[PDB]
Design brief:
Chain A: One of its GO terms (molecular function) is ATP binding. Chain A: It is an enzyme of class 7 (translocase). The structure is cut from a larger assembly and holds 1 copy of chain A (about 450 residues), 1 copy of chain B (about 110 residues) and 2 copies of chain C. In chain A, about 30% of the residues lie in helices and about 20% in strands. Chain A has 14 helices and 18 strands. In chain A, strands 8-14-13-15-16-12-17-18 form an 8-stranded mixed β-sheet, sandwiched between helices. Chain B is globular, with a radius of gyration of 14 Å. The chains are: A alpha/beta (about 450), B mainly alpha (about 110), C alpha/beta (about 375). Chains A and D meet through strand 4, helix 6 and helix 10 of A and strand 1, helix 5 and helix 7 of D. The complex binds adenosine-5'-triphosphate (2 copies), adenosine-5'-diphosphate (ADP) and magnesium ion (MG) (3 copies). One adenosine-5'-triphosphate (ATP) sits at the interface of chains D and A.
Amino acid sequence: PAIDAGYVSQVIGPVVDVRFDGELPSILSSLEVEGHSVRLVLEVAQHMGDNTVRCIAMDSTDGLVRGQKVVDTGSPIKVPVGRGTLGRIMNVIGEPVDEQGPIDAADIWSIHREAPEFTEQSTEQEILVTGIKVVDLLAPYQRGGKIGLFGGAGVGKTVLIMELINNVAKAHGGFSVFAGVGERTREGNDLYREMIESGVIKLGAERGNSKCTLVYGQMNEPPGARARVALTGLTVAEYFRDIEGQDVLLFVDNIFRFTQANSEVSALLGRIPSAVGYQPTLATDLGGLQERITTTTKGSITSVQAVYVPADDLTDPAPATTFAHLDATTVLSRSIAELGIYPAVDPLDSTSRMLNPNVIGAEHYNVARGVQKVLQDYKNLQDIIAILGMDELSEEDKLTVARARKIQRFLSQPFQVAEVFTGTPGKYVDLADTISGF
Amino acid sequence: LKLPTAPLQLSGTSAQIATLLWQVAAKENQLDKVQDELYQFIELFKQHSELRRLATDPFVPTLVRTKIISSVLKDSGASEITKKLFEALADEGALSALLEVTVNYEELMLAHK
Amino acid sequence: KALDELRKPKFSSKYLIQHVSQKLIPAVKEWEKSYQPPVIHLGRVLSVGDGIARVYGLKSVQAGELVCFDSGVKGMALNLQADHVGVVVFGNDSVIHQGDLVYRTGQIVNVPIGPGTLGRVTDGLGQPIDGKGPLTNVRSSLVEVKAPGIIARQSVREPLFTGVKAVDALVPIGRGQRELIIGDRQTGKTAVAIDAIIHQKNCNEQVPKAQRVYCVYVAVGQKRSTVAQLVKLFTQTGAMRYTIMVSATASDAAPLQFLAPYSGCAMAEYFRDTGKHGLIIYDDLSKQSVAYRQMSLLLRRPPGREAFPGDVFYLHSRLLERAAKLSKELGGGSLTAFPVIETQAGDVSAYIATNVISITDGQIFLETELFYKGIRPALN
Amino acid sequence: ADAKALDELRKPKFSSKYLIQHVSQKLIPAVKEWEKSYQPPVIHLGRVLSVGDGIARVYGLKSVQAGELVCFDSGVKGMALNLQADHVGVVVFGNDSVIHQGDLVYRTGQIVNVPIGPGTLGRVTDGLGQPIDGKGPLTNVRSSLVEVKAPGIIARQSVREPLFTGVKAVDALVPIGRGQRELIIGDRQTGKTAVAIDAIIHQKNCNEQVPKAQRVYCVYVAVGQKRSTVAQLVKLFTQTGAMRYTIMVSATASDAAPLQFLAPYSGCAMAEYFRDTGKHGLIIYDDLSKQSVAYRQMSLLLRRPPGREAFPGDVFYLHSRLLERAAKLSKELGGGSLTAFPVIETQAGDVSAYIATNVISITDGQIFLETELFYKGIRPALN
Ligand SMILES: Nc1ncnc2c1ncn2[C@@H]1O[C@H](COP(=O)(O)OP(=O)(O)OP(=O)(O)O)[C@@H](O)[C@H]1O
Ligand SMILES: Nc1ncnc2c1ncn2[C@@H]1O[C@H](COP(=O)(O)OP(=O)(O)OP(=O)(O)O)[C@@H](O)[C@H]1O
Ligand SMILES: Nc1ncnc2c1ncn2[C@@H]1O[C@H](COP(=O)(O)OP(=O)(O)O)[C@@H](O)[C@H]1O
Ligand SMILES: [Mg+2]
Ligand SMILES: [Mg+2]
Ligand SMILES: [Mg+2]
C-alpha cells in the first residue's frame, strides 16, 4: 500500500511536483490528491527525473502541503461519454455540475488521443448555409469542416456563434456539443437556460431526447482546467463521431483560452519562452488538439470555434497558428463594428476553401469575387476620400464608392439572438436571395 | 550558538561545508580525527565501484543511498561528525562533493597550524 | 582513475549548506540540549529582497497560506519548493532580515468579513487604517474563493440605479452585472463610480431591508490624499454607513495592491452569499495589473505582451467572475462590479483594456474629447 | 580548491584504517540488501533521465554519434541532437507519452535516413519515410541519409532548361529555371499553394509529351498543414494523374516537432534520387515558415538560447543547407537537376520578418503574392 502512492514534492501555483518512490506514472496520466478540500486531479505532464513527475492541477492548489499523498489512477483523465451526457453539463474531469445526479455513461473515455490517420480523412466539400449574408456569400461554411470566428474583445464573436447555434443547430439532425473554454460563467448559464426553454435540453425523465452536451471550463477556473476542457469537449464529440456514427456539431467558445492557459503553466514548467510570451510548444499543442476535430469516414464534426485575438493583433502567434487549421475563417473587425455594421465581419479578411467555382457554382462565385472587388477598390480610395473628400474622385470611381458603401450596409444583418437588446427582429436570409440581392 | 572562527574565509557550496565541518570538529576537539576519515573514504571510492556508484549514478534512489551509507556507517569507532556529514550528503546526492570538502579541509587545517 | 568522476561535484539544492548545518550541529555533544532549528511549523528567512522572502523549513505550510514574520509583517506562501518556501510580503520588506523567524498562521490568506466592516477604512489585508479600533462584529473568510458556477447563478433581472442620467438611460446596469468604466485620466471614471455609491445611500432609505445595496470601494494604487478626501465625501453624505473602503495606496507594497481587489471582493461576497446585494468598485483596474506585473517580474517569471505575465487575464477573470446574481436556492443575492481601467490616449486595444472588456458584460467608455467640451459625464 | 592538490588527493594519505578495514566487508552485504531497487548499470545503451515535451534526456549512450537515430524500448524513434558531458538530448519522433524515466534507449548505429528510389513515386509518406497512405510498405526502394551536403562549384552547371509552371503570370514575368530555387512568399490565403499545385499539375501534362529524360518528378512536402488539407490534395493529384510522378511527404500539425523539422530534409533526399540519376526533380517545401517554428520548439526545449523572435541562431543554416541542395548538376554527374519552391507565409505583408528575410537571401527568385492584389480580381496575385 506504500507503493503506487506519491507525495507532493513542491507546489508552484497550478504546477505540482509529485515524487513517486516505487513506480512513476506515464505522461498524460491522471492522479488524485488525498485529503484536499475539493477533488484535486493532477495530470502528469513531465518526468523531471529523480523519481519526480511534474503535474498540472485541474482545480486550485491552495491548501496543498508538501507531504500529501497522491494516488496514481493508472490512466489519463477519463470522462463519461455517450447519449447519457446529452442535456448535461460536465466540467473538465467529467463531473456533473448541473445538479441532475450522476451521468449515465455508455463508456468512460480518456480525453487524450492521437489524431485520426491519413486513411481516415474525408474529402467532401458540401456547403452549410447559415442564413447570414456575409457568411453565405463571401466565405461559405463547409458541412463537415472547421470554422473559425476571429475576434477582438467586443466585436461580436459570441453573438455570431449564438446565431449559428440559432440557425444551423436546429436544422441539424445530429448532436451538438458546446465546449465553453475560458468564457464568462454568466454566458454558460444564459446558454443553459436558453436551451432548456427551447427544448434542446430536457431535464428529468425526458433527458434522453436532448440534443446538446455542455462542457464548461469557464474563466473562473485555474489554467489547468482551461487547458484540458477543450479535450473533454472533443471526447464527447469524438464518441458520437466514431462509435455512434453521428454528424456532430462542436461549438468551442474561444479556443484561444486553450492556448492562453497552456502559457500560464509553461512559465512554471521551466521552459524558455517562445515569441511574444507563449509556450515553445504553441503549434504542436494547438495542432494536437485541432487535428482531432475532423470529418472521418465514419462521422463528421462541423466545428465552429471562436478565436480571440489578444490586442486586436492578427499577427499574434496564437491567432496566426489557428489560421492554418481551418477551412473557413470569419475574421471580425473592430473598425467595422464602430460603423454599426453587425455582424462585424471583414469581407477582405474572411476566407473559405468552399469559395471555389467548382464547388459552389460559377454564378455564386462570380458575385462574391465582384463584391470583394469593389470593396477592395473602396479601400484603395480610403485615404484620398479622407484627406481630399469625394469631390476629387472620378465619376467612374464615385460609382465604385457609392456601390461599395451600399453593399457594406447590405452585408449587415439583424440576428435572432440580438433582437433582445437591439429591438429589431432577426432576419434569416436564404442563399439564393443573397446571390440575387448582391 | 557560538561557533569558533575559521582560520581563513573560503569559497561557496563545497568550501563552506568544509568550513562548517571545521567549526563543528573544533567544538569537539576532533580535527585530526575527522581529517583522516576524509582520506579514508577517498580510498573507499578508489576501491569499490559500488560506493562511488552512490556518488555518480543518478538512478540510485535517494532512499537507497541514505540506507546504504547509514547501514554501512554503524558506530564502529567512527566519528559522529563523519557519521552525520556523509548521510547529509547522501540525503541530497552530494557524495561527489567529498573530494572538495577534503581539499578545503586541508587548507583549513594547515592554516590552523 | 576511479576518482575522475568526483573531481567536480554535481548537485541540486542551492541551499545545500542549510541541510548540512541541520545535521552537523546535532553531532556536537553540547548542542543536543534542544538546540534545534524549528522547521515543521516555523522557518528561517534565507533570502529577502524586492518583496520576496525565501524561507527555509515550513514543512507543514500550505500553498497560499498566510504566514507571519517575527517583525509582525505578514506574508503569503506562494512557491512551495523542495528545499525552501517563496513568500511574497504584505508590507515593507526592510523589516525582514536573513535568519528572521517565519511563523505560519495555519490558514489560507483571509480577510475579516461581515457587518462590522461597514463604515471602516481598510488596507489590502483586512486591518483597519481609519483609527477606530479593530473590527468587532466580523469573521474571517478567504480572499481566494472560486466563483459560483452555472447552476448557482440566475439571470440578471433587477436594476441597479446609478443616479447618473447618461448611465441609467443609455447604459442600464442590473444587479449582478460587471460593467467596465474605461477612459483616459481625468475623464470622470470615479465621478461615475462614486455617484453610484452615494445614490445607494438615497435608495437604501426607501427600499425594504432585503433590497438594500451595500457598497465596497477598492482603491488600488491611488493617492492616500484622494482616498482621505473620498472618506470625507462618504461621511458628509452618509454613504459610509453602507460602504466598506479598501485602500492599497501608491506607497503600499505591490502584493498589497494585488490583493486589495480580492480582499474587497471577499468583503463584498459576504452580502452576496447572505441574500443581500453588493456593489464592488475596483478603481483603476489596470493599476492592480501593474502591481501584479511588478511581482511577476521580480519573481523572474517570463513576461509576455507589454511585459505582463501570462496569467494577467486570470488575474482579472478570477476576480470579476465572483460578481454574480445568485439563484433563488442560494439566497438570491447579487454582486455588481465596476472595474475601472485607465487607457492611454484613448487606446482601448491595449492588453489589459481588451482583457477586462472580454471579461465584463458591458463598458462605459468615457471619451476625453467630450470631457473637455463640457459634456460631463462624457459617455461615448 | 586548485586541481594540483586535488589530483594529489588521488595518492593515499589516510594514515589509519579503522573504516577501510571495517566497511569493505560491510558494503557488499549492504548493496545486496537493496539490489531490488538497483537498476542495472548502463554504458553503451541508454536510460531516460527525464522526458517531457518531446525531449528525452538520456543517461549513458557512450558511443552515440551526433544526429544519430536512437530507439527507445517502447519502439518510438529518437535523434541524438546535443551530446552533453553527462547526458544526451534526444528529440522524440512521435508521442513522448510512451517514454518513462528509466526506459532503456537503444542506439541504432545509423544517422537519420529515409527510403529513396522509384518506389516512393506515388506514395504518401510521413516526415521520416513511413507510408501513411495505407498501401503497404515501400518496395523497390533504398535508404539514404537526410543530411547530404549540397553539390559544390565543380559539380554544378548553369541553369538553362526552363521547367515551365503553367502559370503565365509566372512563366512570362518571373521565369523559373531547371535548377533554380524560387520562393513563393505572401500572406495567408493569397494563393501560395495554388502556384505550387499548378506547377505539379503542369508537369503531368508535360511528362506525357517529352522524350523520357526531360520528365520532371515532383515532390510535395507538406509541413505543419492539417491532415485533411493533405488528403484534399492527394485527391486532386490522383484525379489528375499527377500522383504518378509525385511523392508526398506530410509531417502534419499533429506530428512531433522533430518530424516537421525533418520533413523538408526527408523530402529533399527523396527528390535528390532523381537529381543524382540524371532525371529532373521539383520540390515544394510548402510552409517552410512552419518548419522554422518546429525547429524553434526543439531548440528552446533543448535549452539552446533564443535569438530573434526566440528563433535559434542557426535558423539561417536550417534553410540555407536545405535549399542549396537544389541544384543543376554537371554532365559528369548525369546532368540532372532539382528545383525548389519554398513557401514562406508572412504576417500582414511584413516582408521584413526574420525567417522571411533569410529565405529571400537564400533563394534565387521571389514570387510575391499580395492580399490586396488578390481581392482586385488579379488571381494569381503576383506583385
Ligand atoms: N459630471 C461632472 N461635472 C463636473 N465635473 C465633473 C463631473 N465628473 C467629474 N468631474 C470633475 O472632473 C475631474 C476628474 O476627476 P475624476 O476623479 O472624476 O477623474 P478620473 O478619471 O478618476 O481621474 P484620475 O485618472 O486622475 O483618477 C474632477 O475635477 C471632477 O470633479
Ligand atoms: N488563381 C486563382 N483563382 C481563383 N482562386 C484562387 C486562385 N489561386 C488561389 N485561389 C483561391 O484562394 C484561396 C487561397 O489559396 P491557397 O490555399 O493557395 O492559399 P494559401 O496562401 O496557401 O492559404 P493558407 O494560408 O490557408 O494555406 C483558395 O480558396 C483558393 O482556391
Ligand atoms: N449581431 C450583433 N448585433 C448587434 N450588436 C452586436 C452584435 N454582435 C455584437 N454586438 C455588440 O457588440 C458586443 C459584443 O458582445 P459579445 O459578442 O459578447 O463580445 P465578444 O465578441 O467579446 O464575445 C455586444 O454586447 C453588442 O453591443
Ligand atoms: Mg465571448
Ligand atoms: Mg480616480
Ligand atoms: Mg497552403
